[PDB]
Symmetry: D2
Subunit: 116 residues, 4 copies
């Protein structure tokens, strides 16, 4: 998978399960355009987001529905969601991993690019 | 000041100086309308973004121009910008502080909410 | 105040109030000698930890009692405490601010260093 | 492996390679006692830290030599190292993963406990 997403829960010390993840790509018209989506597994990952042919250079946005996750646990959240926006593949694609760490009033995100 | 923002540089060990901060409010057509903007001082804070009279109920988006910051410094950034999206003042007026910590391939964000 | 500390709660969206902060300095026998201690105020900061006369060159350790904090709140903590170890004043006197963000299973820490 | 460590670099967006990791366990005498150690691979992990028979309930400390890593890249660091101290296995062991994200003047750590 050229693009992987991994979501973790900082309150219970576990992978975040059943979380919706949506990915968008910027078009030449300058608008956001659906590209890929899924729901996190027991590993905290939505499996098989995209393919190598489809993931070209460009500007991408990863949206994680954090509000629905916390509401289900009976814990009051701050954010509507968590978004990560980045430029891809500027010197070709490799393998991209986007990680997100979640708390009710905070989140952190990191990108790991590794040689395939 | 009911909305405050503070930005830090994890590479140089200093406040992130001269960074643009943009604020938008969600409209009834589901578009983002400009609400307020400013630039960080030597302390990493933009002073006087808004007022108590202007800051009503709604869904808000805070956007930090991380890309122009790393470029002026001669460092390659991954993210286009760092975002924060939240519902404000739903159970009455409150004061909000948004903290952001910046690295070339990662960021974190937290919120502190106090009753005025 | 050449050494400052600030602590935040990522679960409640507030400063971490009434948390103990302990400071140690490395001795010539390679043991940690007590140097200073305090408790966080309503702002999440312990005021007046040390002075310019007392804060000489050396290797320092800052320890935050996260375990007693989560327990008073009726939440299960993972970490015993949050630590920060650094060499201070090697190229002359400086001022240091240590920021810490706390969740039950995670923490982050950053340093801001300014010339006095 | 009952205990795994994973180290990431926030400046270059890669796994942190060739980093020394030391693990200690608290003894009844209240002193720190070597338990396991290794060097990070190309994945940012030191492989095969311990075994199931050896990793019993107790208080543990994970030390990551961050200063030697940054010095080798020609980038000036703040911390001497990064330490994580925690109570293990209180209701039996499971599988423990300790993650660490590194910048010159900052680090963050998280623990993920999953059912084996």
């Amino acid at each position: 998978c050229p693009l992987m997403v991994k979501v973790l829960d900082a309150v219970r010390g576990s992978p975040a399960i059943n979380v919706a993840v949506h990915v968008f790509r910027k078009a030449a018209d300058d608008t956001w355009e659906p590209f890929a989506s899924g729901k996190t597994s027991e590993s905290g990952e939505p499996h098989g987001l995209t393919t190598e042919e489809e993931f070209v250079e460009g500007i991408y946005k990863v949206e994680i529905d954090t509000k629905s996750y916390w509401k289900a646990l009976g814990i009051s959240p701050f954010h509507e969601h968590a978004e990560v926006v980045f430029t891809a593949n500027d010197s070709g694609p490799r393998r991209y991993t986007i990680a997100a760490l979640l708390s009710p009033y905070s989140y952190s995100t990191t990108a790991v690019v590794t040689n395939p």
